[PDB]
Amino acid sequence: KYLNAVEKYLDGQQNFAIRRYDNNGRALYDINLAKMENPSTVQRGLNGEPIFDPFKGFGLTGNAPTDWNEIKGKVPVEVVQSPHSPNLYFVLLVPKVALEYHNLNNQVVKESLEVKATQSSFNPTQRLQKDSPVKDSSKQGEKLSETTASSMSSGMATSTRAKALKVEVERGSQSDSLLKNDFAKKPLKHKNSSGEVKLEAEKEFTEAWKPLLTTDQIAREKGMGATVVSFYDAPYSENHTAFGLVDHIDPKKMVENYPPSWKTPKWNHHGIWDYNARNLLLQTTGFFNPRRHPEWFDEGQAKADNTSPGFKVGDTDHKKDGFKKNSSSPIALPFEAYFANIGNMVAIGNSVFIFGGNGHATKMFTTNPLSIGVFRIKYTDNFSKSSVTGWPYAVLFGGLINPQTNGLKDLPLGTNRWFEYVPRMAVSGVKWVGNQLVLAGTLTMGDTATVPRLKYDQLEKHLNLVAQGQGLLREDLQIFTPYGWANRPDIPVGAWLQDEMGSKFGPHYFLNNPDIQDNVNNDTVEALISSYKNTDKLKHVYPYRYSGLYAWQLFNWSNKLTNTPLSANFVNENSYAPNSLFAAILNEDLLTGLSDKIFYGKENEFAENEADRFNQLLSLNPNPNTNWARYLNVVQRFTTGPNLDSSTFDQFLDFLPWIGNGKPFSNSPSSSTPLPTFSNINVGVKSMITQHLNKENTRWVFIPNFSPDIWTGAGYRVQSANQKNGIPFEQVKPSNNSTPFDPNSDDNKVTPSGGSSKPTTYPALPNSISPTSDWINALTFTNKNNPQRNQLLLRSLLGTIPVLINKSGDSNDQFNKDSEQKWDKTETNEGNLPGFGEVNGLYNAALLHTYGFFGTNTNSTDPKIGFKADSSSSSSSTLVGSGLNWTSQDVGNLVVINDTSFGFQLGGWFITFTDFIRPRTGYLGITLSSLQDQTIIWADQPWTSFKGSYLDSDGTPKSLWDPTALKSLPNSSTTYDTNPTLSPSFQLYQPNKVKAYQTTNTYNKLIEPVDATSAATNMTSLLKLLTTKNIKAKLGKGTASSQGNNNGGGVSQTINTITTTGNISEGLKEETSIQAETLKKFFDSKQNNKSEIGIGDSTFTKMD
Amino acid sequence: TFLVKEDSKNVTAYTPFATPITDSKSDLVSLAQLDSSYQIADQTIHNTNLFVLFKSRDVKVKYESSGSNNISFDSTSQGEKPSYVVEFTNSTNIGIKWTMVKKYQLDVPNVSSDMNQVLKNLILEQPLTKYTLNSSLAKEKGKTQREVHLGSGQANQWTSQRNQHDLNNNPSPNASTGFKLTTGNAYRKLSESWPIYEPIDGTKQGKGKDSSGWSSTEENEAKNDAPSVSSGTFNKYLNTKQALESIGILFDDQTPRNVITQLYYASTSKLAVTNNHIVVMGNSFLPSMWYWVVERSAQENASNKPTWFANTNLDWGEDKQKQFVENQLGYKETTSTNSHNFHSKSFTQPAYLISGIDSVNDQIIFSGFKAGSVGYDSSSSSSSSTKDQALAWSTTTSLDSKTGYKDLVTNDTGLNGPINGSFSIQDTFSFVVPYSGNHTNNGTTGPIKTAYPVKKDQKSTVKINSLINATPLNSYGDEGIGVFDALGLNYNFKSNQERLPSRTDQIFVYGIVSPNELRSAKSSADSTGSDTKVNWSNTQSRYLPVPYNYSEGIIDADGFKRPENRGASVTTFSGLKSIAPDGFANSIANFSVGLKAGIDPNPVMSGKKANYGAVVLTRGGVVRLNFNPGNDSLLSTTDNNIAPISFSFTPFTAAESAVDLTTFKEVTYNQESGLWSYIFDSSLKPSHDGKQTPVTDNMGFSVITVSRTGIELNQDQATTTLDVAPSALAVQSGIQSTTQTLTGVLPLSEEFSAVIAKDSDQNKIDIYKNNNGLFEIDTQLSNSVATNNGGLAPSYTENRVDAWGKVEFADNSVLQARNLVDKTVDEIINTPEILNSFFRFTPAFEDQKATLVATKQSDTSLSVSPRIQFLDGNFYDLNSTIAGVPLNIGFPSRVFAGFAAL
């Protein structure tokens, strides 16, 4: 009713129309849908052709088109021509609310985060459930049973280590229970303090975020949903214009095409075991959870928890748990997501597609609506009748396989027979780049931050990670908090308490750390893993000490792409905001030809019960009468960034500059000089990979060069300069202070045929586990990963990469650049590398220097903001924004440059995909053009200033800018100091507390944290930096003090490009180095000539 | 007029209305004057002439180890029924009825004094079967390189003793040299006969090449374990008689005929035609060593001998790949007394599993998998350490090899002898040998050498002879390197990771062959005495392993292998559990079927010949072949690092992976639309399972659509050269039903197509709307066309809308209303656009239109009859005839009068 009143009010005070211009840009007529008197549909023949005489015009039936009463008031936002039928047009109509959505009263348009009155001081952990689960003293005896006797079965290799645990599941015959339900064994429970610590919307989201309008209400209320009307236009004829058909974009015709797995998002194909693991770890369950994505659910956050997941859970008897039951919170298309999904029409044949927009129509500070799928309207008998339907992007993008893209590999863009991966796009646009149809914009990968899981007792000292998993911290980048990771994310809770004391370093569950990783020797695997042969009703948790760093975790447990489609067995979650650029060539004929209604089947459904789930195959023959698979092959190709892979990508990331100040992230152009942030070349000290791990067969396998020396990067560990190459086993992990990990023990030894015992742990280890640790020679130790690299590129272009801070600019809390920062001593605490809480893959000190948080890089006077690795006491730290408020959804028009190149505005950058359609070897395939207006760059809400992009007749795309159109924040903090001030880049970065850093051998082990729950009250001067306004004030950009152009309305144009632009073939290839190092040398040699590499400042001209 | 196979012998022409022509059903086998024992294999249309390939179940061939006519038909029991290819022309005054034009008979190949030596001791593995198991394929590991060169017991002396055996710097003394034939799948000489039983486990069951041992007792034991229908138990064997019969092996009551007869009958399985030549090649279900080249001008009383594939020196891409294939056949210098093998007699790859044969623009395209062939020892005694063992080894490119496809396939790893095995790389393992050339873990130590696994001293006593496998696999060793080569898991560790191609396993062969060399092939076939070689230039080979997704546990492939993958459950063939959904019981041997070339219907730059690309189905994906019509050669790009552009593999999805590849029936190309169609008939499935259980899902059919994708050649000036191989795309088209016995599909027109099916022993018609590649049902039109009242065409429902729509005529008073009085009859006849105003029409489908044709009836009147567009895109009226016979639909002709005398 409120929205109906608003629409009625706006029907009087607002006027909109679509006026047509001649080829010379002279107005001809208006077409004011709210003022067109006696409009009439086109008189049609029997064959459907609209009677038309060029001079008399289109024939009019004299009666208004359908739904005219409820369509006259809507606003036009898009017009698209047909490619075949002459004089036929479609115009996209939306309500005036979708234009005034932001201006609506706050109490009906709320934010998923609340600043509150702050009567008790700001503390980011207040809204986070943090307390850890504790052993159930009434359910101890149902822990998974160790194998009674390992079946030798001619497996001569014998291990004294603890035997595997049995996981037996068999259907039996009981109606609602299983004879054995081992995966459901549940020995843990939530801590009971001031009530049970668990996720429950009722007691947490009292003022729950909810959409304006449920999807059913959008469908029913015709006047509130988008609608497209096919009308015919002729400028020089008497009857110049007349309408055809009117078709509402029904959200129900979209929801009805959701995969059935999306009726129960709290669940996943894994089911009971992962559901239990997540629930106890306080990570929200499922594959697309309203706890993390409240936009898409009619009831919003009111369903944001794991309760009622669509499968029986929490039963007093574990054998009962795991049965399909009634569900109440399916994925839907409420108002915000819907109107993010309406935009960028394209017409193909007799059908017109709406691919959705960038979502800014309803994108608030802490919520990210996106386009979840493709709406299609198909017209029949020559545009006489029509049918409206839509399909989700998930079923369309299932066919993604690495052989397609030329860019990064193993990205989290895959899915499987259950479409638990929910891609959505902030759509730049859809356009024919020559003969190839291109869809472009930004896309949300599968979650890659929460892929590791904490140990059940280490949630009070990893607040950032636990929040990321909880949905309080809507941050996509991977936070480097590796101390408490479980040895394996996918170990059921039935095997967490098999070693409570931790003295034995329980082989099945221990604090993940690669230093104690088992060999891969035939004897080792035969004795440990292969011996416990698994049957249809038995699977084992192997004693093999599985453990690896972030790269290994993702490689095993992320929906990474594979050479075959629908092959991603491990989908954790979906990113919050679009964390990856995406441009895909779609299949025009297939899109035209696919049927309107989709038909899934039992294969797409989840397993009905655990008995069927256990032997659940990944690939099943589709039911004969189903047609869901046909949709899988839409994407002909795709790309996400420059056509570079591995550390070459991070080397380029070093090359791109930061719009905030323009200085490169590398700081290369000038002994304690600043070091690059992403790449490791010339960082730390070279080490030989031939001395790592087995110390065998690696002199020429990883590095083609004769000398396989690899730059360990920042935060490396070495016995001494004389032994920089490889570190021996002196990272012994003690559980208590009780002595080293003690290799050579009977527990950590394997007896092969004959009993010739030997240790199972490597002699020498790689020289770094730092967040910037790269190791082509040890995937178990390496931390840099392609999923991280893509998000890093997107967020570096956006300019909002967070930084860890120990010391703000306050008096007596100042970080001094001089006499306190020593780049030459990165191994010691003098290097200030946190090693805990930092954004994975980057170096905190280098990032801060680039930002200028310390030094005069960004400000005339040193802000004296930095991170200090204190050694004389405990240290607390918090992540803070970059000071810029660009958001990843900030994507403009998709402008086609020529038959082979296209681009769009992205935040403060204009990015042109030079080499996507027809890639050329050796070219990075991307040209970037930065924005020069400081007022726009540093604005509080910059994307409100972008007023569209287009291709200029001269052949260079340009983007409008109105520095007077910036929309300030909703209010001046009312009248009191609001410590949390929402902004598009604002994130509740939780505090991190870390033990004192060692003076020497600082990073030999993982940097241990301590319970940081109570540390919030002791870091007010750091929490105050969470709000972007305070960071800007520190840097001097807080207010008009930025100065420069006062109004400065004008237009910006991308850098001029030529054939040789983007050529890095010299920087690529390999003759005397490694590819990353040679690319680093190449870029370093061209720091003063970034233009020819496709990086430059966009030319800007003033317009009054 | 669509020619569709009624049954094994009858073929009939169907009208676009999906109705057969009267008396058009013809018994072609009798027409060709061939006894009832014959049946037709495949048919092609070329210049409106119908060709047929005839094969008979009565044929019986014999092989004689001595003499001249070693391969000849068995006329003792009137079994001399050679195959025939017959050209048929529709010779009559319009009306589909066929007649003899030319009948070409195919004779058995002649064997030279050099081919005969090889064939005498050649043994052929029993054919792969739809119900074959991985462990059945598996063969127990043979002697290792150390065991075969230094001997057993002499350990820890490899470094010292490897120099004098020309294996300098060899890093894998434990490298396998093949598999022992003492068990496993039954091998048989050309003059012997395969058994109907298959060993479940090929490391413990089956007697392999020991025919005497198998027949003595093991055959009886297999019969006891597996009877023929269940009363059996199948603890050790599978009775695959039904699945052997289904795929084209002839039987005598219960035992298959001799291997030479089986090979001949399998080789006469496919047909392609050209204005000058006709080529016949074998099917995909068992290797075919010989193919016929037929000269259309040959005299009708002459014989058309084939060519030995061993005489066809295909171009495998690079000479390194060619010699890699040629070096695994057998020992070169045997000279024992008569021990001869394909390599020694200077012969190339002898067997291929030809996916299909097709022609376009007078060019013939052939594609298929390289059938494995490798030496084996037959010393039988002191005895050679390699006694009873096949000499095979994986040839995967080493990890060290420089990146780039050319460098990978040219890497000398395994050029001469086995080097792969098991190894440990940092935190993971790489079955491929890490090094090559002269690289080691401590610098350079000189080139790595390899040599054939046969001890030098016993060179005069080792009897080595060739063999032919039933699948692309070359080295059946139950070992990790073998499984990885089969499943395509070998990946180099460098930054620019790539797949190391097993140059001699799972090798896919494709190419285009021209008349200038088909003539040389014919000359080779005619070659008297010593054989003469044939060179095929425009051909190439690409390593195309089975998808890794078809094996349990192997979730994904990367350089870094999960430790569990070292377990014996995944390392070995015998332990490799198969989840293959494509109807095959195994998931370690690839298989292709249904090559069909086609012309690009889309425009092209003026002065450039229209493109033509060919697609061939394969397990888990579609392989497209790209050609340069400007030279009628494989499309290639200058940058060697890029993969050979002429080949592009597109993986499947679940819908296509679920389509049984063993039920391929026919493939048709829609020339005007540009998409293939792969129709699969479930009825081709055998009657009973391998465990003798009746097959419960023999009813149904399904078709797969293959549409072009990517950027094609010569589209625009900036496309005259390409660096990305044009890639195809397969979809589950939409025509599939499990409850109907299909008869045939009709490429009716661009927007529609029809399928003939039977569900109650009575023919039924349902038409499908072709939505630019995909099909879906349109029931409303289906019933309308079905209402033929037994007539040749659907009748016009004058009172209801039907396939012809509904037409309503305007009253004759409209002549007065529009002031047509002044117009003359001729004047109105001259204006069809004015005739339009006399009737209003309601078409039944999109783009359907109707128009009027009128003729004079008097000085003031004329007669008009309507023309209506039909589903096929042809106008139908009173004068409409299909192959002569009138349709006689009975449209409402009208007469109008009232014209002036002007």
Numbering used by the authors:
A (entry chain B): 113 to 782, 789 to 1222
B (entry chain A): 27 to 255, 261 to 412, 416 to 936
Which text from the study accompanies this structure?
The nap particle is an immunogenic surface adhesion complex from Mycoplasma genitalium. It is essential for motility and responsible for binding sialylated oligosaccharides on the surface of the host cell. Cryo-electron tomography (cryo-ET) of M. genitalium revealed the tetrameric organization of the nap particle complex, consisting of two P140-P110 heterodimers. The P140-P110 heterodimers form the ‘tight interface’, while the ‘loose interface’ is formed between the two heterodimers.
